[PDB]
């Protein structure tokens, strides 16, 4: 459906997180227990969800789910 729904889908699938568990306010590393390679894989997966490549330094802005949503709602362009 909308962008947010399917980025939510990929985050859930990547982290094994349940649909009702993931939320915007949560952080990948602390609340969801995501690994660093988990973040790298997640960003790489979004790079093909939308044809937009994320530099390694740009990956510093992907700390929490809400950050991902609000970053990629604008960078989808």
């Amino acid at each position: 459906s909308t962008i947010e729904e399917r980025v939510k889908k990929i985050i859930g699938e990547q982290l094994g997180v349940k649909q009702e568990e993931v939320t915007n306010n949560a952080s990948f590393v602390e609340d969801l227990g995501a690994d660093s390679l988990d973040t790298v894989e997640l960003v790489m997966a979004l790079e093909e969800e939308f044809d937009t490549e994320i530099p390694d330094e740009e990956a510093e802005k992907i700390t929490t789910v809400q950050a991902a949503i609000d970053y990629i709602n604008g960078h989808q362009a």
Binding site: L37, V40, E41, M44, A45, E47, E48, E49, D51
Partner: protein, 722 residues
Amino acid sequence: EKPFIARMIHAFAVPIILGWLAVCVVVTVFVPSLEAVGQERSVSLSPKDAPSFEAMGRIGMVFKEGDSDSFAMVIIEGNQPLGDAAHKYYDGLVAQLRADKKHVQSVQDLWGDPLTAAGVQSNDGKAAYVQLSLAGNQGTPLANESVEAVRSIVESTPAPPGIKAYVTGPSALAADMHHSGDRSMARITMVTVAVIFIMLLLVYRSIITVVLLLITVGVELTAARGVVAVLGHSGAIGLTTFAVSLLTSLAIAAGTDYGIFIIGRYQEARQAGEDKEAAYYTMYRGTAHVILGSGLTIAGATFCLSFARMPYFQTLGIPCAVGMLVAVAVALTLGPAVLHVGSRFGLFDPKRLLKVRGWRRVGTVVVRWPLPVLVATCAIALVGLLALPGYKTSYNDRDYLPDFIPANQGYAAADRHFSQARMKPEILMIESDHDMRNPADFLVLDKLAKGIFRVPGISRVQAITRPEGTTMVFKNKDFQRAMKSFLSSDGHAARFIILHRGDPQSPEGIKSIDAIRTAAEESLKGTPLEDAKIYLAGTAAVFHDISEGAQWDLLIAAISSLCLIFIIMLIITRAFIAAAVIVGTVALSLGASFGLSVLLWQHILAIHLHWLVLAMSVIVLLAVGSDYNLLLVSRFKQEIGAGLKTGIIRSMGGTGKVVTNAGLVFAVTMASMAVSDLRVIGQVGTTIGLGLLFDTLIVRSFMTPSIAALLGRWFWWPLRVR
């Protein structure tokens, strides 16, 4: 989607199971065991176009020493200097051997002559020997029958006190090699199945799934062996113990690999939550073509051996190809069918959890930073070439059979009392329209003998003018018997019996063949006998030719198998660079298998590789490594569309454990042939096992995924992918 053949197998599952079982029983009953056919339809060891074969045939026909390539040495040994009782026993034995005209075509009886007796008696005087010429070429059923008859005659004759008799020679050694290879077949299969059962029980952790997988493998194995036995019994193919053993082990390993792929994909589909019918259909859609590609690759690789020159390679083409085209159809039909039938009763659901976190993490570590990983593994793959400068091949079949073998036991009777070259004589024959009886041509013969006596590594020249081989007459009574055995009845040709210091068969000895030929030419040059034809025969010349031909046949078989595998993968995937990678990442990795096998046998175990090992192992290595790579790349093909790089990670997550299990099962099956009495089969199996361990642990795990992540969409050229 529900593909057609999947629907048909799904509907007719029980009929298919019972049909394949009925075919199995029908074949096992209506044709004999495959090993029994092998000993009924065996091939001759020597190739027909070898100069070392034409020379032996020509010598035999001109000197009336039979018409066969085969020769066998009878050894007499005693605990004391051989008295006249030994001579009487030897006379009785030679008379009996002459009486058996069906097998013994001639008997070069020298010890019965007091003059030439010194030329075969041991320097200690406790042993003696005589050369027999047996019907049928080396290794053929006629030669097998002849050696068995001679052995029975020798061991049935009443030996005097303190005397023993043995039979030896290339023919007896080949017959005993065949019998020992077929004697260990039951043990090879028993240990293979036991090891696989002990292993698979730790992978699935429920005995029922393992037992059904092994029953499928057994049906495949028996169908393949039965069809090959049918073809052999019909006379459409030759066979060798190598062909039978490699067919058995390859059928077992490949059938277990197909069954593991089937069950792995079905269990993954079930874990994903799909029901039985949809799970089976996903299994077929994701593994049907992988198994077919895997079957055709191995069949067309082992079939490429049919282009080899040596019979020990040329006869592995058809039997192995037929066995693999049978074991695959049985796999592709009984596998899905037995899967579905068992799925009715819920046997094949996963008992453990199909955890994939580790392989997905490795996939994201390899897709990210691809080129460093590719370099890091190419360093490992290519450092296996460091064993190439020190690689030394051994042609001595005598060493690679158990010491209890009667042929090998007889050889021991020679080592205890003879120089190790006496039982490996090399013969030089010169032929011309002149009559050699004239004294001038006798001086020419003496010049030839002196010249070849100067050759490095040559110790004795037993000839017409050298009755005892050492340095020293045509009318004397005793010298007449020398005419009877060292000149052609017409006097047009003369033969020289040649003996080496050290093993003539070793890579050092064989090179002397060119030296012998050159020295003979210099002796004959500038002399009336310069026009005389020259031929070389014996173990030295034979295995000089084998050394010449093995390089070319290995090279041609490897190149043809590589091209054929590439064609099959291109057909399966339809992507040029993809198919190129699937086989190139294995070809580069042959260095690691070669290095590991040499480092284990030659350097650590102090056992040189037999010249058969590399040719028989590279063909299987290419095919099986390309098969695992094909599975991985077909899973890429499936999962792509969710991202070119993300599909790679998901595909590793899915197929990581499946390929590890299949690879370990295959490698341990091949590595289980070391139990075979033929240490050559052990070397072949261990080389393939080490190689496939390397592939399954490094090549498909890091090389192919890294290259796929590096090449982006170019990996699938010309396929258009967003």
